[PDB]
Design an enzyme around this catalytic site. Sequence first.
Site: not given
Ligand SMILES: Nc1nc2c(ncn2[C@@H]2O[C@H](COP(=O)(O)OP(=O)(O)OP(=O)(O)O)[C@@H](O)[C@H]2O)c(=O)[nH]1
Ligand SMILES: [Mg+2]
Lengths: 48, 431, 432
Positions: B63, B138, B175, B198, B216, B246
Site C-alpha cells: 500500500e 509484514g 494476527e 509490542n 507507535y 560473531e
Molecule cells: N512497534 C510497532 N508495531 C507496529 C507498527 N505499525 C504496525 N505495528 C504492528 O504490526 C501489526 C500490524 O501489521 P502492519 O505492519 O500494520 O501491516 P502491513 O505489514 O502493512 O500489512 P497490510 O497492511 O495487511 O498489507 C500489529 O501488531 C501492530 O501493532 C509500528 O509503527 N510500530
Molecule cells: Mg499496512
Amino acid sequence: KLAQKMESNKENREAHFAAMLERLQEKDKHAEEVRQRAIEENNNWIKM
Amino acid sequence: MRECISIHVGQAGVQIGNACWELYCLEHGIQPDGQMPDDSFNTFFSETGAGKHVPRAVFVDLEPTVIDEVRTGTYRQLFHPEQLITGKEDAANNYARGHYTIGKEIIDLVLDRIRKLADQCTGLQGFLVFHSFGGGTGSGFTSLLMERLSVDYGKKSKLEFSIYPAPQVSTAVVEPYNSILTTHTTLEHSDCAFMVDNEAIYDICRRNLDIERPTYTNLNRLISQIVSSITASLRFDGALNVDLTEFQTNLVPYPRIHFPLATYAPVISAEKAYHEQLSVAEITNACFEPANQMVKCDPRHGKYMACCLLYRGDVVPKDVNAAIATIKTKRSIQFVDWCPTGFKVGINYQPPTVVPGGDLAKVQRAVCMLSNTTAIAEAWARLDHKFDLMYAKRAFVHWYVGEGMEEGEFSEAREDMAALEKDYEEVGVDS
Amino acid sequence: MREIVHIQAGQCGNQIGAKFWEVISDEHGIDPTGSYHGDSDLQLERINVYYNEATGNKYVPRAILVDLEPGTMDSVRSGPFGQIFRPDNFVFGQSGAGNNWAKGHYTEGAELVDSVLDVVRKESESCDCLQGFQLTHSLGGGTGSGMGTLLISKIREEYPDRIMNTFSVMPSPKVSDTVVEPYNATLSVHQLVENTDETYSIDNEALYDICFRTLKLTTPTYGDLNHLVSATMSGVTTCLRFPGQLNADLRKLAVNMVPFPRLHFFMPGFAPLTSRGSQQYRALTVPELTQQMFDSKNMMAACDPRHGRYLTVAAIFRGRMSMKEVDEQMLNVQNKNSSYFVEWIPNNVKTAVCDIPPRGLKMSATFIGNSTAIQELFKRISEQFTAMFRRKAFLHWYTGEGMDEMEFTEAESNMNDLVSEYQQYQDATADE
Ligand SMILES: Nc1nc2c(ncn2[C@@H]2O[C@H](COP(=O)(O)OP(=O)(O)OP(=O)(O)O)[C@@H](O)[C@H]2O)c(=O)[nH]1
Ligand SMILES: [Mg+2]
Ligand SMILES: Nc1nc2c(ncn2[C@@H]2O[C@H](COP(=O)(O)OP(=O)(O)O)[C@@H](O)[C@H]2O)c(=O)[nH]1
C-alpha cells in the site's frame, strides 16, 4: 521448492473462482429458463 | 567494506525504519539531506559523488500510504526514490495476499532494487529484515522475500527484527495465523531473529516513560534504541566489537534455536533530572529484571545458553567484570549443562543518543543484553494457543483458502511450531 | 485499495442513499455544488474513497442512482444535495416493479440491468484501485430487493475479486406498504447469503420501535426512520473515509468481521439516539457511550444482543474524548460481559476513535456487531414467510412472472440453514 508451491497456489485460486463463475453462470442459465417459461405459458394460454 | 543492507517491510517495518535511520543520522552527524560536516558508518551508508551519505536500505509496502509519508517527510532527501517501493493494493491483514496474490506482482522489482544495492557493496555481510508478524505484508511479503533472498544470495547472513503482536495495539483478529505462517516459512531462511513484543514495549513506555496511552511514535523511538545498540558494533569501531557472524557464533547453538531475548537499560523519562547517573552495576542489574525485557517471558523458569552484554558510553571493563561477578553470586541465573562460557561483553564508546523532543532522557551509559534463553518458547506457546483456538473451528480460514492457500499449509505451519516448542524443551534437558 | 462505487436501488434505496450523501457531504465540508468549503485537512485526506475529483475544486459522488420507477429520481434531483450527483449516473426505467421481487429480479429489472452496468463500468474503469461496491436498498420491495440482488449477481460476475457490501433494509408489519414483504425479503436474503461479503441488517422493526418508544414520536415517518439510518451509515463508514489504523478499507473490515463466509450479516448499533428536531441535548460520556453496546434499545436490528454471542465487534467512537478512557471502558465491558463473547476468537473486539463527531453531536458511538442473536431477525422473516407460504397466498403474483414454487422452498431452506448456522456457533465451546 517455491515453483511447486506458487504454481500449486495459482491452481488453488483459479479453482476457487472457476467453481465460482461456473456455479454462478447456471445462476443465469436458470434465470433464462424460468424466464422463457414466463411468456411461454402466457402464450399457450392464448392458444386455448 | 563489510556492508549491511537493511530491508523494511510493511507498516511496522517501514515506521521502525524511519525511527532507526533518524537515530543513525543523529549518531553519525548526518543531516536529513545526507550531508555531514570514525569511518565504520560506511557499512550502513553509501556515499555519492556530491559527498552525500545514503542509507543502504530498501523500504517496501504493498500500500503506498506509509512510504508516501517518508517521501514527503523530513528525510525525503536522505533516500533515493528507487529505494522506496510501493504497490497499490495492501495485503488486507492476510498472509496469503502478501505471500501470493499481491506479493507476486512486486517481488521481482524489490529483488532488482536489492541487487542494485548489493552491486555497490565490496564486502556485503548480509541483510537486516524489519517487519511485523501480524500484518499481511509484514507476514506474507517477508516470507516470500526471505525465500527469494536465499536463492539469489547463497549463504549470505539474514537477521530479523520481528514485531511480535500485542492486543493493546493489534489491528487484526487474524494476527496469530499470520504470525505462525510467517514463522514456519521464514525459519529455514533466517540466521538470527530478534523479536520485539509490542506489549513489553507498551508497558515500558507506560511504566518507565509515564506515557498514559503510548503511540507507535513512542514505541518506535524505544525500539530504535535497541536496534541501534545491536548495530552500533557494525557502524562504529570500539574497544570491543561484534560483526554479523560473531553475533550468530556466540548466541545461536543450533540452527532453529535462533531467537535471542533483548533487555535494555536505562529507560528514563525526559523529566526528573535526579533519576541519574546510573552506575555500570545498576544498569547491569536492570538487564535481569523481567520489566526491562523486549519480549514478555520468565527467564527464571528457563535456562540460558548464551549472554551477550553490549555496553555504550562511559563504561570501563573493570566496572563491567565487577558487576557480572555480583550477578554470578545471585544463584538464580541458570545455564544449560553443555554451556560453560556464558558472558560475551562488548563496549562501544558513544553514549546513547536521543531524538530531540523525545520521551527518553540523555544518559552517560546504557546496556543491551542479548540472551538465548529457553524461556522465549513461552512467547511461541501464547501465539500457538491463540492459533489453535481459532483453527479448531477453521474461523477465518476461508480468507486464506480463497487466495489459493491450502488448509494443509496451516497444519504444516502449526506442526513446525510444535517441533520448535519441542526443540526448546529438548535443549533445556541435561545430558 | 481506494475507491468505493456506491449504488442506490428502489424507493427506500434512493431515499436512504440521498440522506447518506447529504450527511457525509456535510462531514467532509462539501456543499450542494460539489465545492469544498470546510476548514480541516482530515475532511479531504480520504475524500477519494467516495468522491471523484472533477475539473477544478469540485467533488462528485461516485454514486449510481437506480429505479424502475422515474418519480423517486425526480425527488432526489429536487432535493437539497440533488444537484451534486452526476447527471449520467441516474438510470431509471418507466415500468416499476410493483413491490414484486420477480418483476425486479427477472422481468423489468433484467431489461434495465445492462444500462446500470454500463454506468457502473464507467465509474469502475476510472478507478486507480477499486475496493468494491456499496449498495443501499430495501428487502421488502421489488426494485431495491429483486433488481438490487440481480445487480449484485451481475456485478459479482464482472468484478468477482472486489468487496460487495450492502445496507439492506428489513421489512416490518409496523411500517409495511405491502402484504408480500416476507416473500420479497426471503427471496433477497437467499441472494445476499451467497453474493455479498458484508451486509448491514437495517431493521424497520427496530427503527420504528426506537422512534415510537425512545424518541416519543407517536406517528413516525420515513423521514424519522431515515434520520436513524443516516446516523448509522455515517458511523459504520467513518473508518473508510477518515485516516485510521483499524478497518480502513472494505477488505480489512471483512477479514476482521467475517469468520465464516455465510455469517456476514451485521447488527449495527448507535448511541446517543436523537430525533430530527432534537438539537438540544447536553449528555453522553465515555462510560455512557460504551454501555449502550449491549443495549438492545440502541440496536438497528430488532434483536437482543444478550440473547446471543458476539463473534466479532467493531466499535467506532467519534468526538473529542480520552483514548485511555475508551480503552478502559471497552475492556471493562468485555470482562463484565464475558459470556456474550465467543472464547474461541481471541481479541475479537476492535476499537477506533475519530476526532470528527457527526453533525449535531459532540460525542457519538457506532457499533458493528457480528452476533449470533441476528438469528432472531431471520426467524421473524421465516415465520412470516411460512404463514403465507403454507396457504400459497399471493403466490400468483410471482408464478405469473414465470417463477416456480421450488425457488420459494429453496430460499426459505437456505435462510433456515443460516439460522441453524448461527445457533451452531452460539453453542460452540473452546473445550478443544
Ligand atoms: N512497534 C510497532 N508495531 C507496529 C507498527 N505499525 C504496525 N505495528 C504492528 O504490526 C501489526 C500490524 O501489521 P502492519 O505492519 O500494520 O501491516 P502491513 O505489514 O502493512 O500489512 P497490510 O497492511 O495487511 O498489507 C500489529 O501488531 C501492530 O501493532 C509500528 O509503527 N510500530
Ligand atoms: Mg499496512
Ligand atoms: N427506512 C425506510 N424504509 C423505507 C423507505 N421507503 C420504503 N421503505 C421500506 O421498503 C420496503 C418497500 O420497498 P420499496 O423500497 O418502497 O420498493 P422498491 O421501490 O420496489 O425497492 C418496505 O419494507 C418499506 O417499509 C424509506 O424511505 N426508509
